[PDB]
């Protein structure tokens with residue numbers, strides 16, 4: 001059935017970052033893989049992300065949020081960084097395994 | 102228009118602003134203290150030495 | 163020049179019928195914006211508080227040569243007439259201007275600049291890689307104390 | 309056990325008034341400075 | 357050379373690069389106000405401590421009275437004494453929120469800043485511990501006796517370290533004079549290490565409530581945070597002073613208005629509020645050594661938090677499950693606190709063992725687990 005889907009969309013809404021207009025990926029802690037992943041982003045996706053973040057920080061400082069209409073919707077959240085991040089990790093593991101044996 | 106006058110005479114030059122803060126403090130102290138003690142004592146009528154003092158201050162033995 | 167603060171800078175006194183803009187504009191590398199702004203606002207405060215008779219003597223001579231240079235050719239003299247009538251409702255000669263200019267002294271410059279600059283809330287426009295220039299509040303505090 | 313009793317309370321009173329007065333003034337000041345950021349507006353204008 | 361003497365001067369450059377032009381996130385909340393308060397508090401404790409130390413006498417026959425003399429005879433000695441003892445409390449209230457904030461917003465990812473933070477906590481705890489002995493009242497003596505006696509539960513090196521630390525066979529004058537010296541000393545080490553704390557911090561810069569790069573929106577520490585911090589100060593200071601001047605003995609144990617007596621054990625030996633939670637965990641494990649270890653770990657556990665972070669997000673702002681777990685933990689601590697002030701009797705004994713058990717469970721098991729679970733609910 002649709003259990004996992006109901007849970008996921010539930011959590012997504014419970015989390016609330018969409019209220020700041022943030023995309024799930026905009027909320028990733030910038031560890032090393034994410035740092036690299038971001039460097040691989042196309043200029044436009046990078047600048048869009050940048051504005052979204054600066055926008056959230058300004059809301060956060062103001063102690064306000066976006067008008068309900070503008071909240072990112074679960075099914076419209078573009079996972080723009082995940083493809084890159086998964087590759088950066090794919091490469092790192094290869095190197096890691098190769099430097100052992 | 103005091104705000105205007107005050108701004109031109111007191112708050113404009115940093116030099117007069119500081120000078121204002123000093124005399125402001127001097128005056129404020131004198132006033133805040135009197136008012137404070139006055140409130141405190143009034144709240145405690147007849148309990149302080151100041152009050153019952155007359156009973157033994159040259160009025161005994 | 164000493165600290166390589168900018169590629170260029172200019173002051174301007176853009177007048178209008180009932181209002182105007184008195185300021186300055188500079189172009190500089192991303193990493194020297196702060197110091198330039200700092201030194202610039204500095205010079206503005208120097209204007210309101212310590213201008214010397216030496217500085218004015220020269221300023222007047224520079225301004226005289228400047229007004230005369232605006233009358234070098236027929237087109238520029240025509241422009242002056244067109245604007246003078248339109249803005250001052252008549253023409254103001256070099257002989258009159260010069261009189262006005264000669265009247266200016268240190269004392270006067272200080273008082274006039276203090277009147278329009280000191281402790282005022284400026285208007286700011288910044289374009290480009292401006293990260294190093296920041297906070298209106300900080301710019302605002304630059305508007306007081308020599 | 310505590311001879312300062314009275315003075316201690318007379319002070320507490322002054323401490324309160326000044327405390328109220330100062331906390332107030334500093335609250336305005338803080339708000340006044342932050343107003344620049346609190347009201348700030350921004351837009352994203354790509355060459356799109 | 358540099359145009360403004362704030363950038364070039366080897367000293368004004370320092371005051372500047374850490375308190376005036378220092379880039380701070382535009383959105384740090386009031387929970388970021390505690391670092392400065394902790395600092396101001398520290399400078400304050402030192403000042404009032406020196407003032408008191410100038411009228412104190414480190415000797416078992418004069419300690420209790422020298423403090424009484426200070427309150428009774430020294431101009432404003434009572435006030436200085438009040439501020440010092442209550443300042444220690446303020447200090448801890450501030451430090452606990454400082455830590456809390458850090459746990460909630462994942463600041464511990466700044467490992468060196470975090471590990472030095474832990475060392476500051478321990479140093480502060482030892483400092484208050486020795487400082488508490490100085491007035492030499494009943495709780496001062498028995499607290500000293502009971503606690504320092506736990507070390508003899510260590511293997512072999514135990515029974516020694518104790519009589520070495522005491523300078524004799526029981527807590528006596530030699531112990532007192534060496535405690536005054538340590539109490540006078542440790543605060544400076546705290547100041548020292550605090551400098552290291554802020555140095556590591558400045559490498560990265562402050563974290564912020566959303567846990568995302570604030571590089572796109574940094575603001576000068578001054579006037580934004582200088583004004584915000586000063587306001588935060590006055591806000592806290594009002595209750596501190598209110599409680600101090602209107603209810604001086606609210607927090608203190610009355611057993612300490614009675615000169616230490618080695619031949620009379622007080623009915624209920626308990627620490628100041630800020631140590632209660634740890635006392636509870638200490639008493640939870642009956643067996644001198646295991647209780648010591650449990651106490652040790654109750655604080656040393658902080659060195660592990662950085663390693664039990666499994667979330668892909670830095671803060672808990674967007675993690676509802678972790679949030680409640682977090683507040684469960686906080687409430688878990690009020691309970692241990694409460695238990696710490698209650699005698700060792702049913703139902704307290706069992707409630708106590710539970711609260712302890714839950715405390716370590718939440719930090720070592722649940723937190724890392726729920727984080728993993730949460731990553732899957734985001735489809736990560």
Ligand code: HEM
Pocket residue numbers: 387388389390391392394395398451454455458461462463464466469470472473474476477546550553554557561562563564658
């Ligand atoms: C002597 C006591 C302490 C002092 C003087 C102190 C001071 C500071 C100061 C001034 C800040 C910066 C402003 C702020 O975020 O509050 C800071 C940040 C920080 N401190 Fe402390 N601190 C103390 C103890 C500790 C403790 C016990 C911990 C945790 C075990 C700690 C962890 C941190 C961390 C992780 C930050 C990063 C804050 C962030 O940006 O998220 N500090 N501290």
Ligand code: HEM
Pocket residue numbers: 398401402403404405406407408409410412423437440441444447480483484485487488489490491539540543546
């Ligand atoms: C981190 C800072 C400090 C803390 C946490 C602190 C804490 C304490 C505590 C809890 C007490 C017992 C208070 C009571 O009577 O109940 C105390 C007392 C005392 N402290 Fe400190 N102290 C600090 C710094 C200092 C310093 C720097 C000195 C010395 C220059 C000092 C000198 C004293 C003295 C003389 C007493 C004994 C008199 C009294 O009991 O009030 N303290 N301190």
Ligand SMILES: CO/C=C(/C(=O)OC)c1ccccc1COc1nc2ccc(C)cc2nc1C(F)(F)F
Pocket residue numbers: 478481482484485486488489495496498499500501502503625626627628631632633634635636638651655
């Ligand atoms: C000299 O003793 C001073 C005590 C005190 O409360 O100081 C403020 C005191 C008084 C009565 C009973 C116990 C204590 C000290 O307690 C502690 N004191 C501690 C001192 C340092 C550290 C790292 C942990 C401590 N833990 C505790 C615990 F409460 F858990 F027993």
Ligand SMILES: CCCCCCCCO[C@@H]1O[C@H](CO)[C@@H](O)[C@H](O)[C@H]1O
Pocket residue numbers: 315318319322323326327593
């Ligand atoms: C938040 C800071 C509050 C500071 C309040 C200062 C008021 C203390 O004022 C005190 O009052 C006593 C009683 O009249 C006098 O005896 C003392 O000399 C005087 O210093």
